[PDB]
């Protein structure tokens, strides 16, 4: 299993394939390691039908497609270009020696009469003319050549990250889990106890697996987290490698951004008419582009269907399917669903709708996609099941024949159908409505800045419900503010250093213009004042009447308590500024910067360990903008499947926005367990 890399949704072109019955993952690893009839390379298994199929075909020779239902595992002994130490595991597609001499077959007696042969020593693995190491050489795997002038000779093959790292160690798989000075390592995947901003469901191709050390931003060797509490990360005295670093390509002498609706788009039935900016899935991933070839091969590009329309990393359906589908960034998962509703220009759409995924979905529908009937989950014709029926799964429900998920397809709820051509078949099954405007969720749909653009554009008018004027007892802003309850407002304690009397200060809640507001904009006064316990640059306020909830008042959604964003991610930042003269006087402004994590931050270029684990790094990198951007409070906004979730608070008594110097934030996640405790008590 640890020598197999999963590929969830894939089928490879087979002749020389078996079939047979299998209940478990693990039972058809068995026949793998085996090796009977053929010496398998790759396997295909079905979790529902409980079908699997040993192949000998892999990536390299045969063509990789989208199927149902359908897990692949790869051999990496076989799919490994380089060579293990002395190479005796190595089962590369090596054609050519040192030199440059044609490899000459192992069963061919002509020219040269060899020793080793496939029907002597099978064992070994001597594939037709590769180079393969059967006497235990130390210098490599060798062959035979073509030319009659040599009998034998090495090859020129690289090596492994395994046992000694490249250059920096930036593709590094070396299974180390100890630091230079003895300390135990952390997990990528768990958050504790230090939070930080590479989670290894957002970063699939940066190998960030388990424990193991992995170079993502540049550093001098692999780095990782420890357990120990007191040191966050420490740097590992891996061995370097004395064999040639590997090629970069040339020596002589852009992305896809975020175009996802956040108001939900709806496709018309099949979703082949379906033109949309959306290019998220329904667990939450990076869509992969059309044109692009990495990390998934396919033949689905523009050249093939021009009439779908098939650009940049948007939601299409070419070849016709139940719903839209489009590949993802991750190389572990293929293919997955798009987060979209249905159109509306069995049971009724209005009571009985699904959660999420239709995991707790217990409705009264009985119709497929096609129109199908659904057959019993208890019955066993036409089609045979030992799992997944009414006595297994006690924790699902399964009554008659009604929709139910309990293993949590990525289609939604699934059912058996009367049909014997078709084993399950998934269902048109409405998605909950709100009942209420949630947190993060505005009615107007934004501009989308990208992040080159320097300074910013003008915002859509009420696209940023959330955004807090703090205006005077007369009427003039001065700072911003974010809003999380209709009675509580989140911003700095910067602002309340002037004056500390509640009365003074003023709440103006949906604006777009500064000097002439607009008609219906609320104003409601400060009732009491609240400070952070530390004394750290983040306050609390509480209104005198509560806010109405309407299509231009919305608040911003709350973060899981300690939660750090992922590392270069583009974040939205709202607020007025310092206006002057330049397009946009009086007016709402949006700006796009990408969060930096703490690490790379804390470097000598950047800040030099002025950052703590409280303070939130955002801004450029390369080419930056002298003047700031937003207001003091302003909110630091992220797009995670359908909704803006608030980060950061803006604060110019930590960092101010310079080129090639990212500004300091007051992360919000930190301090979340000490904004819930105020909501709840009063």
Not at 174 to 179: E, L, P
Not at 339 to 362: A, I, Q
């Amino acid at each position: 299993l640890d020598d197999y890399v999963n590929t969830q949704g894939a089928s490879l072109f087979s002749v020389t394939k078996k079939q047979l019955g299998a209940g478990s993952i693990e039972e058809c690893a068995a026949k793998c390691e085996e090796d009977e009839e053929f010496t398998c390379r790759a396997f295909q298994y079905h979790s529902k039908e409980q079908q699997c199929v040993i192949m000998a075909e892999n990536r390299k020779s045969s063509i990789i497609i989208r199927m149902r239902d359908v897990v692949l595992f790869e051999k990496k002994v076989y799919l490994s270009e380089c060579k293990t130490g002395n190479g005796k595991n190595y089962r590369g597609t090596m054609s050519k020696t040192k030199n440059g001499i044609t490899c000459q077959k192992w069963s061919s007696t002509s020219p040269h009469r060899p020793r080793f042969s496939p029907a002597t020593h099978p064992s070994e693995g001597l594939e037709e003319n590769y180079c393969r190491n059967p006497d235990n050489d130390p210098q490599g795997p060798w062959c035979y050549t073509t030319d009659p002038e040599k009998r034998y000779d090495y090859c020129d093959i690289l090596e492994c990250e395994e046992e000694c790292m490249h250059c920096s160690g930036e593709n590094y798989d070396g299974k180390i889990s100890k630091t230079m000075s003895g300390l135990e390592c952390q997990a990528w995947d768990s958050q504790s106890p230090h939070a930080h901003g590479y989670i290894p469901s957002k970063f699939p191709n940066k190998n960030l697996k388990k424990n193991y050390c992995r170079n993502p931003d540049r550093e001098l060797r692999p780095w990782c987290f420890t357990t120990d509490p007191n040191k966050r990360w420490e740097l590992c005295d891996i061995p370097r490698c004395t064999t040639p670093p590997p090629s970069s390509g040339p020596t002589y002498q852009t992305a896809p951004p975020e175009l996802t609706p956040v108001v939900q788009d709806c496709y018309h039935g099949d979703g082949q008419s379906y033109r949309g900016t959306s290019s998220t899935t329904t667990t939450g991933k990076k869509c992969q582009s059309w044109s692009s070839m990495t990390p998934h091969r396919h033949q689905k590009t523009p050249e093939n269907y021009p009439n779908a329309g098939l650009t940049m990393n948007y939601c299409r359906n070419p070849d016709a399917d139940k719903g839209p589908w489009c590949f993802t960034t991750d190389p572990s998962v293929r293919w997955e669903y798009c987060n979209l509703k249905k159109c509306s220009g069995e049971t009724p759409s209005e009571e009985d709708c699904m959660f999420g995924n239709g995991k707790g979905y217990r409705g009264k529908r009985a119709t497929t996609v096609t129109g199908t009937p659904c057959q019993d989950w208890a019955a066993q014709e036409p089609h045979r099941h030992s799992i997944f029926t009414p006595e297994t799964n006690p924790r699902a429900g399964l009554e008659k024949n009604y929709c139910r998920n309990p293993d949590g397809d990525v289609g939604g709820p699934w059912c058996y159908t009367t049909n014997p051509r078709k084993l399950y078949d998934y269902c048109d099954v409405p998605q909950c409505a709100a009942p209420s405007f949630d947190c993060g969720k505005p009615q107007v749909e934004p501009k989308k800045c990208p992040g080159r653009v320097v300074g910013g554009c003008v915002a859509h008018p009420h696209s940023w419900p959330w955004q807090v004027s703090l205006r005077t007892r007369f009427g003039m802003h001065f700072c911003g503010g974010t809003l999380i309850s209709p009675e509580w407002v989140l911003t700095a304690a910067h602002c309340l250093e002037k004056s500390p009397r509640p009365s003074s200060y003023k709440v103006i809640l949906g604006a777009h213009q500064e000097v002439n507001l607009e008609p219906h904009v609320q104003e409601i006064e400060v009732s009491r004042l609240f400070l952070e316990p530390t004394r750290k640059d983040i306050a609390l306020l509480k209104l005198s009447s509560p806010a109405v909830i309407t299509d231009k008042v919305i608040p911003a959604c709350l973060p899981s308590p300690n939660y750090v964003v992922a590392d270069r991610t583009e974040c939205f930042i709202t607020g007025w500024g310092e206006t002057q003269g330049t397009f946009g006087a009086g007016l709402l402004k949006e700006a796009q910067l990408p969060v930096i994590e703490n690490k790379v931050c804390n470097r000598y270029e950047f800040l030099n360990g002025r950052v703590q684990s409280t303070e939130l790094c955002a801004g450029h990198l390369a080419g930056g903008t002298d003047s700031c951007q937003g207001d003091s409070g302003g909110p630091l906004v992220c797009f995670e499947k359908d909704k803006y979730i608030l980060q950061g608070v803006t604060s110019w008594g930590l960092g101010c926005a310079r080129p090639n110097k990212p500004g300091v934030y007051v992360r919000v996640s930190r301090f979340v367990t000490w904004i819930e405790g105020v909501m709840r008590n009063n």
